[PDB]
């Protein structure tokens, strides 16, 4: 017990952007200063110019991981191993929180690049983000809140089948606790979707495949 709370606290504490704040910005409600819309080459050039005048995303997941109960007690090389293979899956998982059917938030919510502008670029740049919009559209259909996402990301990182782990015994017992807590939290937070946990298991495998497809498309640069 008290594991879902401490994992949810580490998530709210270590992640600057969450689904609550993202949906508030995307709503265009409690602010008369909406994010800057990147929807063409000119607006993209405007945004790119101010950026020159992600390590933060990976650092946020690292601090969140070592704040998961038991993760700091692991061997240092296992903590590196668990983070090295699971960071991209967690990034793409939480990336759904800032995405809608028409675009995504960028730069801590200060910008919004439209989905159509991304798929209008020439090959192979228009193929980088569209697979993530496809995952996010079906992942957001599950209607997970930040309490669910915190436990979902924790199960992505703490898995004892990562290549090269040493203390595989403790990592599998730690995953057993996270998964058991995720299963019980899912039916308590989303009771009318009783197969939500099997659905999430398939999404974790989709993320592994989406990350593998991301590395291939990245190397063609």
């Amino acid at each position: 017990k008290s594991l879902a709370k401490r994992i949810y606290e580490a998530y709210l504490k270590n992640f600057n952007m969450n689904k609550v704040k993202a949906r508030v910005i995307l709503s265009g409600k409690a602010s008369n200063n909406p994010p800057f819309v990147i929807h063409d080459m000119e607006t993209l050039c405007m945004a790119e110019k101010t950026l020159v005048a992600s390590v933060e995303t990976v650092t946020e997941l690292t601090e969140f991981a070592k704040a998961i109960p038991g993760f700091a007690n692991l061997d240092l090389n296992d903590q590196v191993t668990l983070l090295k293979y699971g960071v991209y899956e967690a990034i793409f998982a939480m990336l759904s929180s800032v995405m809608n059917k028409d675009g995504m938030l960028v730069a801590y919510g200060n910008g919004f690049i439209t989905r159509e502008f991304l798929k209008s670029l020439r090959k192979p740049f228009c193929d980088i983000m569209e697979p993530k919009f496809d995952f996010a559209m079906k992942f957001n259909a599950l209607e997970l809140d930040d309490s669910d996402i915190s436990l979902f990301v924790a199960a992505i990182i703490c898995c004892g089948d990562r290549p090269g782990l040493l203390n595989v015994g403790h990592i599998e017992k730690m995953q057993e606790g996270i998964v058991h807590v995720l299963r019980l939290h899912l039916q308590s937070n989303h009771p009318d979707d009783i197969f939500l946990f099997p659905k999430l298991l398939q999404k974790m495998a989709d993320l592994r495949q989406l990350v593998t497809e991301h590395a291939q498309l990245v190397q063609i640069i």
Partner: peptide, 14 residues
Amino acid sequence: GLEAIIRKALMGKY
């Protein structure tokens, strides 16, 4: 290659 980035963030509080 990001093992460098994550190992630095692991040793951030010190």
